[PDB]
Design a protein around this ligand. Structure first.
Ligand SMILES: CCCCCCCCCCCCCCCCCC(=O)OC[C@H](COP(=O)([O-])OCC(O)COP(=O)([O-])OC[C@@H](COC(=O)CCCCCCCCCCCCCCCCC)OC(=O)CCCCCCCCCCCCCCCCC)OC(=O)CCCCCCCCCCCCCCCCC
Ligand SMILES: CCCCCCCCCCCCCCCCCC(=O)OC[C@H](COP(=O)([O-])OCC[N+](C)(C)C)OC(=O)CCCCCCCCCCCCCCCCC
Ligand SMILES: CCCCCCCCCCCCO[C@@H]1O[C@H](CO)[C@@H](O[C@H]2O[C@H](CO)[C@@H](O)[C@H](O)[C@H]2O)[C@H](O)[C@H]1O
Ligand SMILES: CCCCCCCCCCCCO[C@@H]1O[C@H](CO)[C@@H](O[C@H]2O[C@H](CO)[C@@H](O)[C@H](O)[C@H]2O)[C@H](O)[C@H]1O
Ligand SMILES: CCCCCCCCCCCCO[C@@H]1O[C@H](CO)[C@@H](O[C@H]2O[C@H](CO)[C@@H](O)[C@H](O)[C@H]2O)[C@H](O)[C@H]1O
Ligand SMILES: CCCCCCCCCCCCO[C@@H]1O[C@H](CO)[C@@H](O[C@H]2O[C@H](CO)[C@@H](O)[C@H](O)[C@H]2O)[C@H](O)[C@H]1O
Ligand SMILES: CCCCCCCCCCCCO[C@@H]1O[C@H](CO)[C@@H](O[C@H]2O[C@H](CO)[C@@H](O)[C@H](O)[C@H]2O)[C@H](O)[C@H]1O
Ligand SMILES: CCCCCCCCCCCCO[C@@H]1O[C@H](CO)[C@@H](O[C@H]2O[C@H](CO)[C@@H](O)[C@H](O)[C@H]2O)[C@H](O)[C@H]1O
Ligand SMILES: CCCCCCCCCCCCO[C@@H]1O[C@H](CO)[C@@H](O[C@H]2O[C@H](CO)[C@@H](O)[C@H](O)[C@H]2O)[C@H](O)[C@H]1O
Ligand SMILES: CCCCCCCCCCCCO[C@@H]1O[C@H](CO)[C@@H](O[C@H]2O[C@H](CO)[C@@H](O)[C@H](O)[C@H]2O)[C@H](O)[C@H]1O
Lengths: 558, 37, 73, 188, 75, 87, 494, 80
C-alpha cells in the first residue's frame, strides 16, 4: 500500500509542474497513510515470534506490525504541517455547522495564510517522506543481511534529500552535504559489518547466524569470534545514524541548519526504525552461558555509548543558546536512556525500551510542533532587538534563539504552558509521562545490577534539567521583546470578509482586524492532544503498558 | 561549512563570558568579600 | 509591586547588603579557609559522631533503683 | 593469595593508558592548523601523552601495591589506586585544591564502579531461579530471633526474654558487682 | 562556610566548573566535515580497542575522567 | 590481503584530508570497492552465487549514492561558489 | 465516590472556574480572588467533616474506596491518625496563605491563584496516597508550580532562588527513587499494607536507608545542604513562603513514618548515631549563623532549619514520646513560622521595600498591634510554655535523650540558642530605641486583614499549647504501630 | 476510573485546550456543538480501549498460566 501510494503519487506529480498542487499532494499522502494503517491493523491476528515472508528476506512480528502502525501515525501528524495553512481567520458569525458546511467565506487569504510560503511549494515533498517511510518499515521487517543494507540506504538517501530540498537555502544545502558525507562513512561501517558476517558464516540469513551463535554458546578450529566483532562494526554505523555519542557531532549542526518543518521529520523517524531493528538482534545474540564469547559482547559499545550519551547530551547542552542545537543535544541524552535499556536485555528493560521510545517520539513531536506554531504566531508581532535582524534563513527557522521566546507567557499563556509541560516531561518530573519512562529504565537496570549506570543517569538528569529550566526561565520569568504590530490595529485598517450562502449570495459582510486571525485548528488540536497525554497519563496507562507487556512476553516466550 | 554566528565558540563567549565569575586575588580581595573597603 | 512608604535608604547600608548577598562569588581556597572548613565540617561532626557511637545504649535510667547499675553494657 | 609483581603490572598500566593518550596527541597533530610537521606529536602534544602514561601507570601500580599490603582482592583496592591516580592528574595542573579534588572524584568513582559490580562488561550471573529468589524475599516475613540479634544486638530497647539475667551476668563480669535491687515495701 | 566553602564545594563550584567544561567540549564542534570524519574514526578505534584487547573496564573510566578533566582546563 | 589494504587506503583518505570534500567522496567509493571485492573473492571460495548477487546490488546502491552525493554537491556549489573548506 | 477524593477535586474545580469566568463577563481580579478563597474554605470544611467521623483507635486505613480494578499506576486514598493532622494543617494554612497575600501580587493574579489551587491538591495528595511510588509522585509534582511561583512573583534574586530549590529537590529526590524502585522489585508492589508486612534483609535495609536519608537530609534540610531554603523562602512571594515552610518542609517529616520507621527498622537503629550527629550539628551551626543574619526574612528561614533538626532527632528516637513530639513540633512550626513570615515578608517588606534589620528600630512606638503579635510569635519560636511549640520540643528532646543521651544534651542547647536569636531579632525591630530615622514618613499599623490572620495563627498556637490532647488523642494508637522493640516480660505471650 | 468517562472528558479537555492555545473565546454559542463532538469522539475512543483491555486481559491471563505450566512441567521432570 505504501508502494501503491508512491507510484500513484509519483505518476500524478510527474505530469504536473503546478506548485499550488502541493497542498493537495500532502493531503492525499495523509489519506494514503491511513489506508496503510487499516491494512497493518488487520495484520494483528496471530501470536508469533516471527513469520518469514517473500522467500525469507522479510519477516512479520506483532512488534513489527505494531511499530509499522506507529511510524505511519507519526508520519501523518508531521504531514499536517504541509497539508494545512499555518493561520486561519475565524469569526463567531461563521462558526456553526450550517456555516462550515453549507455557507462559504470570501476574503484576500494570500498574505494572511502565507499561501505561497516555501513549505507550500515543494511538489515532491510529500513523495520523498513516503520514500523515507518505506525504508523505515522495511528495516523493521528485514530477515536478511542484504535486505538490511538495502533498506537502511533507502531510508538514509531520502533523509539526505529532505535536508537539501530547500535549494535556495545556503544553510540547508550545507546541512545535507554534511549529512550525506558523514552518513556515507556510516554506511561503509554497516556494509563492512554485514560483509564480514557472510565471509565467516556463508549465510546472509539472520536466523542461520542466530542458530550458529546458539550452538556456539556452550560453557575448536573455528571459534566464532567474528559474530561479536562483525556486530560491533555493524553497531558503529547504526550508532552514528541515531547520533549516540561519541558519533554525535553531526546532529546539532544538521538539525540547526535545515528548516524546522524538515527537522521535525528528520530527527524522529530514523531513530524509531533503527532502535526496533537492534532490539531483536540484541535478544538473539545474547549469551545464556557466561563463556569467552560473552566477554566480547557487541552490546558493550551500546553500554559505553549510553554512558557517553548521558554525559555529553547533558553537559554540552548547558551553554547552548540556539534552540535547535539545544533540542539536538537533548535527543542525545534521551538515546542514552534508550540505549541503556537495550543493553540490559531483560523482560523489564525491553518493556521500558518500548515505552521510552514511543512516549519520547510523541513528546519530542510536541516540542517541534510548539516551536513551529510559535514562529507562525509572531506574524502580528514586531521586534526592534538587534540580535534578531542578523539571523539567517528566518523563514526556514523563524525561531532560532532561545532569546526569541522571552516573555512568550505574556503573548500566548497556554502555548507557553504546553511547552512547559513538554519540557518538564523531558526532565522527568511526575506526574508527567516522561517520568514513568525513565522510572521503568531505572528499575530495570537496578534490578539487573546496572546500579553504577543508574546513578550516572540520575546525576546527568540533574545536569540536563539545567538547560531545560533555562528555556522555561526565558518564557515565563521575563517580559516580551516582541510587541504587537502597530499597523495591524490602527482602527482604520480593516479587511472585508464576505459570507456567502450555497448559491454565492451575500449573506453578510464583516469588517475584520488582525485580532480575527488565529492559529489553524490542525496545529492547535494536535498540540492539545499530546499535552493532555503527557499530563493525564496516570489515568490512562493500562492499555499502552499492557501492549508492551504482551509484546515482550511473545519475544521472550518459550 | 556553517557560519561562525551559529556554531562558533566566539558567540558562546558572549552568552557565557568568563567574566561572569570573579577571580579577585589576595591583593585585590584579602577579605574575600568582593574588594569591599 | 505595591508602593511602599518613603525610606531614607542609606547608600552605605545598601551597598553593604549588596556585598553580603554576592560575597560567595569571591570565596577562595586558602590555607585559612581550608583550616576553618575542615574543622567545622569534618572534625566537630566526627567527634560528636564518635561519642555518639561509643555511648550508644550505654545507659538506661528507667525503673533503676538502688542496688542496680545505670550502665546497660 | 598469589602475590602480584606491582612494578611489572605498573608498566602495563602506563603503556595501555599512555598508548591511548599517544593516539589522542596524534589527533592534535593531525588537526593542527599550522605546518607543525610530524615531530609535533612529541614536542607540542608530548605533555598530553606523557600525563596519560603517568596517570595510568600510577593507578595500576598503586592498585597492585595496595593489594599486596592488604593481602586481599576487593573493591577497596580500586579506591587506593583511584586516589593515587587522581592525585597524579592534579600534579600536572600544579594547584593544591585540585590535587586533592581530582583524587577525590577519581577514587570515589573507581571504587563505586567496582563495589557495584562491573557494569561496562557482562554482569555476573548467579545462575539460579529468579522466581524462587524474588518470591523468598517477598515471603520471608518472619526471621529467627537469633538472626536479628546478630546485626543489631540486645539493648537500645531490644530487650529479648532473658535480658535481665544476662545483663546481671554481663555486669558482674565487667563491674564485679552483684545486682540486687531494693524492695521498696517495708512489709515483705 | 555557608557563603563560602559550602557554595564553592557545591552549587556555585559545580556551576562555574561545568560551564567552563561545556564551553571547551562545545568548541570541538567546528562544522568541518573533514574534522568530524576524523572524530568518527577515532571513536571507532577506541571501541575496537576496548572490545578486542579485553581491557579492564576500569581502564576506560580512567580515560573518561582524564578526558573530562582535560576539557576542565582552559587554553 | 588486497581487500584489506584497499580498505585502509579509503580509511587513510579520511585520515589525510583537511580540505578535499571531493576526496571524501572518493574514499567512500574505495571502501565500497574493497568490501565488494572481499564478498566476491569469498564467494568464489565457497561456490556461492549469492555473493555475486550481493556484490551487484552494492554496485547499484554505490552508483545511486554517487548520483545523490554529486547532486547535493552541485546544490551546495550553486550558492557557495567554492567546494573548499576554510581551514 | 469517596470523601478523600472530594478533597482533591474541589481545588481543581476552583482552577476551572477562575479560567472560565472571563468567558461570561474583563472580569475584576477581586472576583478571581473570591473564587480561590471560597474554594479553599470548602476544602477546610470537608476536612473538618472527615475529622469528626475519624476513628482515633483504628488500625485499618479509613475513607478508602474499593478500587477492584488494578493498573500499573492507580490512586489509592486512605487516612490514618498519622496523616489526619497533616491534612488539617494543609487545609488551615492555604486559606490564610491566600488572604495574607491578597494585595501584594498585583500582576499575573489568575496565574498566582491557579498555582496555589494546584499546590493545595498536590500537597493534599501526598498525605492521602497509600503507595510509596504514589507518595514520590506527589512529593515531587510540586516542583514545577514552585519553580514558576518564585520566578513570576518572587523578589530580586528570584531566578537563582528558583533554580536552587528545583535542582536540589530534584537531585535529592532521585536517590529516594532508586531506593523505592528496589523495594518494589523485591516485594512486587509499593501499596503500604503489602510493604509493611515485608521484612528486608539487613544489608538491603542499610542500602535502602542510604537513599531515603539522602533525600530527606536534602529536604529537611540539614546544615551543609540548606542553601536552597535560604534562597527559596526569602525570594519567594509571601504566600509561597508560607506553603514551603509550613507544608513542604513537613513532607520529609511525614515520609519517615512511611518509608523508614515501619520497613527499615534495623537500619534506622544501627544508624541513629549518624542521624543524631548530623542533627546535633545542624542545631548548633544553624543557630550560631541565625544570630548574625542581617535579612529579616532569611532570619525566619534559618530558624526553620534548627527546628526541623529537633523533630528529625525525635522521629529517630524509637520512643512513643519523641515520635508524637516530632509531629507536634511540625504542627507547631506550621503556625509559628507562618506568622513570622507574615510579619517579615508581609508587613515590613510591604511598608519599606527592604528586609535589612539595619533599617528597623522602635517599631512598637507607632505599630503597637504588630509588636504584640510579633512578640507572641517570637516566644513560640523560642519554645516558651503555653504555646504548642514548647510541648513538641519537650517530647522531641526527651525521646532524643532516652535514645542516645549525649546528642539530646547538645540538642537541648536549642533552649538557649533559639531564645537568643528570637529575642535579639525582637529587641532590634520592635524595641531597640526610638522609631528609626531611616523612616521618612510614618507607617500605618496592622490592617484588619493583617490583624486577623496573625490573630488566627496565634490562636491556633496558644489553644493547642494549652490542650495538646486535641491532637495527641488521634496519634496514640497509630504512633504505637511504628515503634521497634520488645520488653522481656511483655513479649511473646502464650 | 471509568474509561468512557475519562475519554469523554479527555475530548472535552482537548477542546478547551485548543481554544486556549488559539486564544479564542471559550463558550461562543454558535460553536458550542464542538463540545459534544469532541466528547463524542472521546467516548468512542474508549469503547475501543474497552475492547482492547478485554482482549489484553484474556491473553495476559493465559501467559501467566503458561509460565506456571512450564515451571511445573520442569519441576515434575526434576523429581526423577
Ligand atoms: C489518545 C487519543 C485520544 C483521542 C480522543 C479524542 C480527542 C478529541 C477529539 C478531536 C476531534 C478533532 C476533529 C474535530 C474538529 O476538528 O472539529 C472542529 C471543527 C470546527 O471547529 P473549529 O476548530 O472552530 O473550526 C475552525 C474552522 O473550521 C477553520 O479550521 P481550519 O481551517 O484551521 O481547519 C479545520 C479542520 C481541517 O480538517 C478537517 O477538515 C478535518 C477532516 C477530518 C476527516 C477527514 O481542522 C481539523 O479538523 C483539525 C483536526 C485535527 C485532528 C488530528 C489531530 C491529531 O470541525 C469541523 O468542521 C471539522 C469537520 C467535522 C468533523 C468530521 C470528522 C469527525 C471525525 C474526525 C476524526 C479524525
Ligand atoms: C498523543 C498521541 C496523538 C496520536 C494521534 C492519533 C491518536 C490515536 C493514537 C493511536 C491509537 C491507535 C491507533 C491505531 C489505528 C486506529 C485503530 C482504531 O482505533 O480502530 C480500529 C479500526 C479498525 O476497524 P476495521 O474496519 O479494520 O475492522 C473492525 C473489526 N471489528 C468489527 C471487530 C471492530 O479502525 C480502522 O479502520 C483502522 C484505520 C485507522 C485510520 C488511521 C488512524 C490513525 C490514528
Ligand atoms: C495510549 C494509546 C492508546 C492505547 C495504545 C494501545 C492500544 C492497542 C494495543 C494493542 C495490542 C494488545 O492488544 C492485543 O494484542 C495482541 C498481540 O498480538 C493482538 O491480538 C491479536 O492476536 C490474537 C491471537 O491470535 C487474537 O486473539 C486477537 O483477536 C488479535 O487481535 C492485538 O494487537 C490485540 O488484540
Ligand atoms: C549538581 C549538578 C547539576 C547542576 C550543575 C550546575 C550547572 C549550572 C549551569 C548554569 C548555566 C547558567 O548559569 C548562568 O546563566 C546566566 C545566563 O544569563 C548567567 O548569569 C549571569 O547573569 C549576569 C548577566 O546577565 C551575570 O553578570 C552574572 O554574573 C550571572 O548571574 C551566567 O551565564 C551563568 O551564571
Ligand atoms: C539524664 C541524662 C544522662 C543520663 C545518662 C548518663 C548516666 C551516667 C551514669 C554513670 C554511672 C553509670 O554506672 C556507673 O559506672 C561506673 C563506671 O563508669 C561504675 O562505678 C564503679 O566504679 C568502681 C570501679 O572502678 C566500682 O568498684 C564501684 O562500685 C562503682 O562506683 C558503676 O558501674 C556505676 O557507678
Ligand atoms: C555512593 C555510591 C555507593 C555504592 C552504590 C550502592 C551500592 C549498593 O549495592 C549493594 O551491593 C551489594 C553487593 O552484593 C548487594 O548487597 C546484597 O546483595 C545480595 C542481596 O540481593 C546479598 O546476597 C548480599 O549478601 C548483599 O551484600 C546489593 O547489590 C546492594 O545492596
Ligand atoms: C549538592 C550540590 C548542589 C545540588 C544541585 C543544586 C544546583 C543549583 C545550581 C543553580 C545555579 C544557578 O543557576 C543560574 O543562576 C544564575 C544567577 O547567578 C541565573 O542567571 C539569572 O540571574 C541573574 C542574576 O544576576 C540575572 O542576570 C538574570 O536573571 C539571569 O542571568 C541563571 O539563569 C541560573 O541558571
Ligand atoms: C557539606 C558538603 C556537602 C557537599 C555535597 C556535594 C557537593 C558537590 C561536590 C562537588 C562540588 C564542586 O567542587 C568544586 O568543583 C570545581 C571544579 O571545577 C572547583 O571550582 C573551582 O576550581 C578552582 C578552585 O579550586 C577555581 O580556580 C575555578 O575557577 C573553579 O572552577 C572547586 O575546586 C570545587 O570546590
Ligand atoms: C507542568 C508545567 C508547570 C505547571 C505550573 C503551574 C502553572 C500555572 C499557570 C497558570 C495558567 C496560566 O495563567 C495565565 O496567565 C496569563 C498571563 O499572560 C493570563 O492571560 C492574561 O493575563 C492578563 C489578565 O489581565 C492579561 O493582561 C494578559 O494580556 C492575558 O494574556 C491568563 O488569563 C492566565 O490564565
Ligand atoms: C550515601 C548513599 C549511598 C547509596 C546511594 C545509592 C543507593 C540508592 C539505593 C540502592 C539500593 C541497593 O541496591 C539494590 O540492592 C538489592 C539487594 O540489596 C539488589 O538486589 C540484587 O539484584 C540482583 C538480581 O538478583 C542480585 O544478583 C544482586 O545480589 C543484587 O544487586 C538490587 O539490584 C539493587 O538495586
Amino acid at each position: 500500500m505504501i508502494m501503491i501510494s508512491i507510484l500513484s503519487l509519483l505518476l500524478s506529480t510527474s505530469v504536473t509542474l503546478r506548485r499550488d498542487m502541493s497542498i493537495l499532494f500532502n493531503r492525499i499522502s495523509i489519506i494514503a497513510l491511513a489506508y496503510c494503517i487499516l491494512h497493518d491493523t488487520m495484520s494483528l491476528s496471530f501470536i508469533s515470534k516471527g513469520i518469514g515472508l517473500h522467500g525469507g528476506l522479510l519477516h512479520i512480528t506483532n512488534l513489527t506490525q505494531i511499530f509499522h502502525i506507529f511510524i505511519f501515525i507519526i508520519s501523518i501528524l508531521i504531514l499536517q504541517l504541509t497539508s494545512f495553512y499555518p493561520r486561519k481567520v475565524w469569526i463567531p458569525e461563521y462558526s456553526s455547522l450550517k456555516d462550515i458546511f453549507f455557507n462559504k467565506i470570501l476574503y484576500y487569504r494570500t498574505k494572511i495564510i502565507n499561501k505561497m510560503g516555501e513549505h507550500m511549494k515543494i511538489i515532491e515533498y510529500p513523495l520523498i517522506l513516503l520514500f523515507v517511510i518505506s525504508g523505515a518499515v522495511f528495516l523493521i521487517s528485514t530477515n536478511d543481511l542484504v535486505s538490511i543494507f538495502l533498506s537502511i540506504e533507502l531510508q538514509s538517501y531520502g533523509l539526505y534529500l529532505l535536508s537539501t530540498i530547500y535549494r535556495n537555502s545556503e544553510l540547508s544545502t550545507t546541512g545535507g552535504l554534511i549529512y550525506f558525507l558523514l552518513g556515507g562513512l556510516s554506511s561503509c561501517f554497516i556494509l563492512l559489518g554485514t560483509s564480514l558476517l557472510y565471509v565467516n558464516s556463508g549465510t546472509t540469513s539472520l536466523d542461520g547466524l542466530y542458530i550458529l551463535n546458539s550452538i556456539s554458546d556452550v560453557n575448536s578450529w573455528y571459534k566464532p569470534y567474528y559474530l561479536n566483532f562483525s556486530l560491533l562494526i555493524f553497531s558503529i554505523g547504526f550508532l552514528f545514524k541515531v547520533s549516540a555519542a561519541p558519533f554525535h557531532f553531526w546532529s546539532p549542526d544538521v538539525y540547526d541548519a535545515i528548516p524546522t518543518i524538515v527537522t521535525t521529520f528528520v530527527a524522529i523517524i530514523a531513530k524509531i526504525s533503527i532502535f526496533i531493528f537492534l532490539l531483536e538482534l540484541v535478544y538473539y545474540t545474547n549469551s545464556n552461558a557466561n563463556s569467552y564469547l560473552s566477554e566480547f559482547s557487541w552490546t558493550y559499545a551500546l553500554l559505553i555509548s549510553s554512558l557517553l550519551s548521558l554525559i555529553i547530551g547533558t553537559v554540552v547542552g548547558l551553554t547552548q543558546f540556539r534552540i535547535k542545537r539545544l533540542l539536538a543535544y537533548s535527543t542525545i541524552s534521551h538515546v542514552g536512556f534508550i540505549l541503556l535499556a537495550l543493553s540490559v536485555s531483560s523482560i523489564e528493560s525491553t518493556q521500558a525500551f518500548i515505552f521510552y521510545l514511543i512516549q519520547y517520539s510523541i513528546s519530542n513531536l510536541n516540542a517541534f510542533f510548539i516551536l513551529i506554531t510559535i514562529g507562525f504566531s509572531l506574524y502580528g508581532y514586531v521586534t526592534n532587538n538587534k540580535e534578531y535582524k542578523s539571523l539567517l534563513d528566518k523563514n526556514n527557522s523563524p525561531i532560532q534563539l532561545i532569546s526569541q521566546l522571552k516573555g512568550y507567557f505574556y503573548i500566548n499563556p497556554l502555548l507557553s504552558l504546553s511547552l512547559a509541560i513538554t519540557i518538564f516531561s523531558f526532565v522527568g518530573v511526575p506526574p508527567l509521562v516522561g517520568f514513568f519512562a525513565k522510572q521503568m529504565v531505572l528499575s530495570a537496570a537496578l534490578d539487573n545490577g546496572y546500579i553504577f549506570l543508574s546513578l550516572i543517569a540520575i546525576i546527568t538528569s540533574v545536569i540536563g534539567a539545567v538547560y531545560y529550566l533555562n528555556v522555561i526561565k526565558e518564557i515565563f520569568f521575563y517580559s516580551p521583546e516582541h510587541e504587537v504590530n502597530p499597523v495591524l490595529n490602527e482602527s482604520d485598517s480593516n479587511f472585508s470578509l464576505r459570507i456567502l450562502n450555497e448559491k454565492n449570495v451575500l449573506i453578510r459582510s464583516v469588517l475584520l482586524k488582525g485580532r480575527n486571525i488565529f492559529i489553524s485548528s490542525p496545529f492547535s488540536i494536535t498540540i492539545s492532544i499530546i499535552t493532555n497525554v503527557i499530563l493525564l497519563f496516570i489515568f490512562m496507562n493500562k492499555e499502552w503498558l499492557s501492549m508492551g507487556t504482551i509484546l515482550v512476553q511473545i519475544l521472550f516466550s518459550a | 561549512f556553517l557560519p561562525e554566528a551559529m556554531v562558533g565558540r566566539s558567540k558562546i563567549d558572549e552568552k557565557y563570558p568568563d567574566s561572569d565569575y570573579p577571580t579577585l586575588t589576595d591583593k585585590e580581595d584579602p577579605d574575600m568579600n568582593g574588594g569591599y573597603i | 509591586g505595591l508602593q511602599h512608604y518613603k525610606i531614607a535608604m542609606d547608600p552605605a547600608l545598601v551597598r553593604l547588603g549588596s556585598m553580603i548577598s554576592n560575597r560567595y562569588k569571591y570565596f577562595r581556597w586558602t590555607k585559612r579557609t581550608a583550616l576553618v572548613s575542615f574543622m567545622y565540617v569534618v572534625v566537630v561532626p566526627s567527634t560528636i559522631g564518635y561519642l555518639a557511637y561509643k555511648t550508644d545504649g550505654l545507659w538506661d535510667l528507667r525503673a533503676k533503683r538502688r542496688g542496680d547499675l545505670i550502665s546497660e553494657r | 593469595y598469589h602475590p602480584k609483581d606491582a612494578v611489572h603490572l605498573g608498566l602495563k598500566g602506563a603503556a595501555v593508558v599512555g598508548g591511548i593518550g599517544l593516539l589522542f596527541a596524534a589527533v592534535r597533530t593531525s588537526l593542527a592548523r599550522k605546518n607543525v610537521g610530524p615531530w609535533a606529536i612529541f614536542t607540542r602534544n608530548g605533555k598530553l601523552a606523557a600525563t596519560f602514561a603517568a596517570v595510568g601507570g600510577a593507578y595500576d601500580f598503586t592498585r597492585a601495591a595496595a593489594a599486596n599490603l592488604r593481602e586481599k582482592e576487593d573493591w577497596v583496592n580500586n579506591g587506593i589506586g583511584g586516589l593515587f591516580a587522581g592525585a597524579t592528574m592534579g600534579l600536572t595542573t600544579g594547584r593544591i585544591p585540585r590535587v586533592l579534588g581530582f583524587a577525590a572524584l577519581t577514587g570515589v568513582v573507581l571504587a563505586t564502579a567496582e563495589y557495584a559490580g562491573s557494569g561496562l562488561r557482562g554482569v555476573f550471573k548467579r545462575d539460579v531461579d529468579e522466581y524462587e529468589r524474588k518470591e523468598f524475599l517477598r515471603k520471608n516475613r518472619r526471621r529467627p530471633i537469633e538472626e536479628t540479634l546478630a546485626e543489631i544486638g540486645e539493648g537500645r530497647g531490644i530487650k529479648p526474654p532473658g535480658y535481665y539475667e544476662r545483663r546481671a551476668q554481663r555486669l558482674k563480669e565487667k563491674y564485679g558487682v552483684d545486682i540486687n535491687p531494693v524492695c521498696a515495701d517495708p512489709d515483705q | 562556610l555557608d557563603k563560602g566553602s559550602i557554595e564553592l564545594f557545591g552549587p556555585y563550584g559545580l556551576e562555574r566548573g561545568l560551564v567552563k567544561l561545556s564551553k571547551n567540549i562545545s568548541s570541538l564542534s567546528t562544522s568541518h566535515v573533514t574534522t568530524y570524519a576524523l572524530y568518527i574514526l577515532v571513536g571507532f578505534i577506541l571501541y575496537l580497542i576496548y572490545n578486542n584487547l579485553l581491557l579492564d573496564y576500569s581502564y576506560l573510566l580512567l580515560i573518561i575522567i582524564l578526558l573530562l578533566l582535560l576539557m576542565m582546563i582552559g587554553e | 590481503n588486497i581487500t584489506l589494504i584497499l580498505f585502509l587506503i579509503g580509511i587513510l583518505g579520511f585520515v589525510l584530508n583537511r580540505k578535499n570534500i571531493i576526496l571524501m567522496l572518493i574514499s567512500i567509493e574505495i571502501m565500497l570497492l574493497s568490501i565488494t571485492f572481499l564478498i566476491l573473492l569469498s564467494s568464489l571460495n565457497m561456490d556461492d552465487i549469492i555473493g555475486q548477487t550481493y556484490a551487484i546490488y552494492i554496485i547499484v546502491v554505490a552508483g545511486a549514492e554517487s548520483a545523490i552525493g554529486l547532486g547535493i554537491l552541485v546544490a551546495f556549489y550553486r550558492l557557495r561558489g567554492s567546494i573548499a573548506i576554510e581551514y | 465516590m469517596s470523601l478523600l477524593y472530594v478533597l482533591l477535586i474541589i481545588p481543581i474545580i476552583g482552577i476551572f472556574l477562575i479560567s472560565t469566568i472571563d468567558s461570561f463577563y474583563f472580569f475584576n481580579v477581586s472576583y478571581y480572588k473570591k473564587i480561590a478563597l471560597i474554594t479553599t474554605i470548602l476544602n477546610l470544611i470537608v476536612s473538618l467533616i472527615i475529622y469528626i467521623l475519624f476513628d482515633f483507635s483504628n488500625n485499618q486505613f479509613q475513607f478508602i474506596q474499593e478500587n477492584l480494578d488494578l493498573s500499573f499506576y492507580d490512586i489509592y486514598l486512605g487516612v490514618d491518625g498519622v496523616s489526619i493532622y497533616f491534612v488539617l494543617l494543609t487545609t488551615i494554612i492555604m486559606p490564610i496563605a491566600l488572604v495574607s497575600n491578597w494585595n501584594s501580587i498585583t500582576n499575573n493574579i489568575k496565574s498566582y491563584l491557579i498555582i496555589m489551587l494546584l499546590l493545595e491538591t498536590l500537597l493534599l495528595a501526598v498525605f492521602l496516597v497509600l503507595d510509596v511510588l504514589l507518595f514520590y509522585i506527589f512529593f515531587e509534582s510540586i516542583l514545577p508550580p514552585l519553580f514558576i511561583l518564585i520566578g513570576l512573583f518572587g523578589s530580586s534574586n528570584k531566578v537563582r532562588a528558583s533554580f536552587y530549590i528545583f535542582l536540589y529537590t530534584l537531585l535529592g529526590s532521585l536517590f529516594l527513587l532508586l531506593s523505592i524502585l528496589t523495594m518494589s522489585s523485591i516485594v512486587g508492589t509499593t501499596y503500604f499494607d503489602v510493604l509493611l508486612k515485608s521484612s528486608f534483609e539487613y544489608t538491603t535495609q542499610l542500602f535502602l536507608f542510604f537513599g531515603i536519608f539522602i533525600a530527606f537530609a536534602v529536604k529537611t534540610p540539614v546544615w551543609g545542604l540548606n542553601s536552597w531554603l535560604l534562597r527559596a523562602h526569602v525570594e519567594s512571594p509571601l504566600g509561597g513562603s508560607i506553603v514551603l515552610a509550613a507544608i513542604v518542609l513537613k513532607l520529609s517529616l511525614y515520609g519517615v513514618f512511611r518509608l523508614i520507621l515501619p520497613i527499615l527498622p534495623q537500619a534506622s537503629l544501627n544508624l541513629t548515631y549518624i542521624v543524631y550527629a548530623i542533627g546535633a550539628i545542624t542545631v548548633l551551626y544553624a543557630s550560631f549563623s541565625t544570630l548574625r543574619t542581617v535579612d529579616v526574612k532569611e532570619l525566619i528561614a534559618y530558624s526553620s532549619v534548627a527546628h526541623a533538626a529537633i523533630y528529625l532527632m525525635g522521629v529517630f528516637s524509637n520512643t512513643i514520646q519523641g515520635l508524637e513530639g516530632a509531629i507536634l513540633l511540625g504542627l507547631a512550626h506550621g503556625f509559628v513560622s507562618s506568622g513570622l513570615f507574615i510579619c517579615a515578608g508581609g508587613i515590613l517588606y510591604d511598608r519599606t521595600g527592604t528586609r535589612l534589620i539595619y533599617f528597623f528600630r522602635g517599631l512598637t512606638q507607632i505599630m503597637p498591634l504588630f509588636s504584640l503579635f510579633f512578640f507572641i510569635l517570637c516566644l513560640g519560636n523560642a519554645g516558651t510554655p503555653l504555646t504548642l511549640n514548647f510541648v513538641g520540643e519537650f517530647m522531641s528532646l526527651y525521646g532524643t535523650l532516652e535514645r542516645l543521651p549525649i546528642a539530646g544534651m547538645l540538642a537541648s542547647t536549642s533552649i538557649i540558642f533559639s531564645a537568643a536569636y528570637s529575642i535579639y531579632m525582637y529587641n532590634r525591630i520592635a524595641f531597640g530605641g526610638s522609631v528609626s530615622l531611616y523612616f521618612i514618613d510614618c507607617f500605618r499599623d496592622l490592617t484588619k486583614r493583617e490583624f486577623f490572620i496573625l490573630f488566627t495563627l496565634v490562636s491556633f498556637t496558644v489553644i493547642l499549647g494549652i490542650y495538646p490532647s486535641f491532637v495527641l488523642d488521634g496519634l496514640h494508637y497509630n504512633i504505637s504501630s511504628v515503634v521497634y522493640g520488645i520488653e522481656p516480660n511483655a513479649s511473646y505471650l502464650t | 476510573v471509568n474509561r468512557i468517562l475519562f475519554w469523554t472528558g479527555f475530548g472535552l479537555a482537548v477542546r478547551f485546550w485548543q481554544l486556549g492555545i488559539e486564544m479564542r473565546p471559550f463558550f461562543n454559542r454558535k460553536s458550542l456543538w464542538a463540545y459534544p463532538l469532541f466528547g463524542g469522539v472521546g467516548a468512542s475512543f474508549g469503547y475501543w480501549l474497552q475492547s482492547i483491555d478485554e482482549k489484553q486481559t484474556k491473553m495476559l491471563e493465559e501467559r501467566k498460566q503458561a509460565i506456571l505450566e512450564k515451571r511445573a512441567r520442569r519441576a515434575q521432570r526434576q523429581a526423577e
